[PDB]
Every structure is written in structure tokens, then in C-alpha cells.
């Protein structure tokens, strides 16, 4: 996260770290959506251009964390993966369309002050809140600048951007399964996700019911915090029927 701040304790209790077993290193962010299901970006698990194709036994999820590198004894919980599910129409060849994946845990995680699931949006919450100018929140342990790493989880609030501005900022083909967020050059304020924040959540706090909803997944960008560029996020609600099909079937 570039130009963010340190998270407060328990500020993002749905935050998940995707962790490689060997070598031991951070792979991505993710989010907790129930006691057994974790949501992330498909490109965190499968990206053939970079020879990335992880299997369940390659990975762990670490839940309840604040510190990036410490083993947070008596606070964090580490879970093994039972199964990965990648969206069947995830487009790794072109533009990361439908950049979404689910991970089922081998055993349910116990909720605590530090571990708690986020809501997924319904149609009405998405329609009401996914509007240009409305701000969401992005969290992660990724890089602090494009070209180092944070001691603790970072947080930045960013406004959703008008779709024509998103489209006009890039040569990559944008789809309805994406939205973009970030400040414009003339707005002064700054901030973005960066490498290592992939797969983590873009959340909004509903003013109707005072609950946090995950509207996006950190998906892609061109650099980090560049003027005139914006971060792109998987549109969770647009893919929710697939999420529900997977959870209901498995």
C-alpha cells in the first residue's frame, strides 16, 4: 500500500495473508468470508505468464495478523487449504477479467477479536455504494512504493472513479467485472495498492446498516500511485453468483 497508514488493531479482522510454505514468504492478500472460506484474486494462484500455478499443499493462510513478518503467537491462526477454486472464465491471457478465486480451509477457523468475516454485497448495496466519488478501503502488506515493505498492515481509503476515466487511463481492455479507484492528479491526495496487495479486499461500510462489505479485490494496476493511473479491482457483486454456486456445491 502506497501513501497509506498503519492499521489499528482489529481494524480489518477479515484480512488474510496468503503465505508460501517454501520458501516462506508472503504471496498475496485475501479475505475471510466465513469460518471455512477465503476469497482472493485468481492471479494470486494461477498466472501462467509468470509460471505461477500453485496447488493447495504449496500454501498456507494466516488469519488475524497485524505484523507482516512476526509469528503473532496467541493471536494469528494458520490454516491449511483443502481446495482451490478458480473462476472458470478467469482471463489470464489478456486482461485479468474475472480475477477471483476461493479457497476452502481444511478446518473451520475460530473467530476472535482479531478474526471475523466480511459481508459480501447484495444487488442493492452494490447499486447504492458503487458510485463515482464514494470511498472504499484497501488493506495489505504489499510494497510501500513502486520502486520498502511495511512492519504492519497498511490501510488507505480511495474513491471509486468514473468508468470513462478508468477506461481513458489505460490501454488495457476494461470490463464490467472491474472497477477502478484512486485520486485524480488534481485532487491532491494520493494512495494506491501495490505488488503484494493483490487479492486483498476493497471494503465499504454501509451507511444503511453499519456493516462492512467487500466490493472489490485488488486485481491489477500499471505501477503504483502514478499520477493519472488508477488501481483496478474485481467487481465482487458481478461474480457473486459464481461464489454462491461454489460454496453451495462444495
Amino acid at each position: 500500500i502506497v501513501e497509506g497508514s498503519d492499521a489499528e488493531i482489529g481494524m480489518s479482522p477479515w484480512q488474510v495473508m496468503l503465505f508460501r510454505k517454501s520458501p516462506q514468504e508472503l504471496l498475496c492478500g485475501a479475505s475471510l468470508i466465513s469460518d471455512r472460506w477465503v476469497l482472493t484474486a485468481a492471479h494470486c494462484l494461477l498466472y501462467p505468464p509468470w509460471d505461477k500455478n500453485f496447488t493447495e499443499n504449496d500454501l498456507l493462510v494466516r488469519i488475524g495478523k497485524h505484523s507482516r513478518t512476526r509469528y503473532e503467537r496467541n493471536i494469528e491462526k494458520i490454516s491449511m487449504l483443502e481446495k482451490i477454486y478458480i473462476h472458470p472464465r478467469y482471463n489470464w491471457r489478456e486482461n485479468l477479467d474475472r480475477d477471483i478465486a476461493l479457497m476452502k480451509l481444511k478446518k473451520p477457523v475460530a473467530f476472535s477479536d482479531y478474526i471475523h468475516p466480511v459481508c459480501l454485497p447484495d444487488r442493492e448495496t452494490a447499486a447504492s455504494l458503487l458510485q463515482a466519488g464514494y470511498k472504499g478501503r484497501v488493506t495489505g502488506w504489499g510494497n510501500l512504493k513502486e520502486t520498502g515493505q511495511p512492519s504492519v498492515l497498511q490501510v488507505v481509503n480511495l474513491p471509486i472513479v468514473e468508468r470513462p476515466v478508468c477506461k481513458d487511463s489505460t490501454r488495457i481492455r476494461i470490463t464490467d467485472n472491474m472497477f477502478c479507484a484512486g485520486y485524480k492528479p488534481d485532487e491532491g491526495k494520493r494512495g494506491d495498492a501495490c505488488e503484494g496487495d493483490s487479492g486483498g479486499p476493497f471494503v465499504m461500510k454501509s451507511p444503511f446498516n453499519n456493516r462492512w462489505y467487500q466490493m472489490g479485490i485488488v486485481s491489477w494496476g500499471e505501477g503504483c500511485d502514478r499520477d493519472g493511473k488508477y488501481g483496478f479491482y474485481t467487481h465482487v457483486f458481478r461474480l457473486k453468483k459464481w461464489i454462491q454456486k461454489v460454496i453451495d456445491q462444495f
Binding site: 459481508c119 478501503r137 481509503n157
Partner: peptide
């Protein structure tokens, strides 16, 4: 989950975090 999106150390105690108001102010 019935309880999703309500943080134990914030919403469940009626405590606000330091920047959530920035989000609320944007929901015009």
C-alpha cells in the same frame, strides 16, 4: 454469516476507527 461485517473491536463495542468517517462523508 448473520454477524458479518461487524468488527469485535469497533462496531460490536460502538467504537469508531480513525478514518471510517472519511468513507461516510463520501456517501453523498
Amino acid at each position: 454469516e448473520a454477524d458479518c461485517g461487524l468488527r469485535p473491536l469497533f462496531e460490536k463495542k460502538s467504537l469508531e476507527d480513525k478514518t471510517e468517517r472519511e468513507l461516510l462523508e463520501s456517501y453523498i
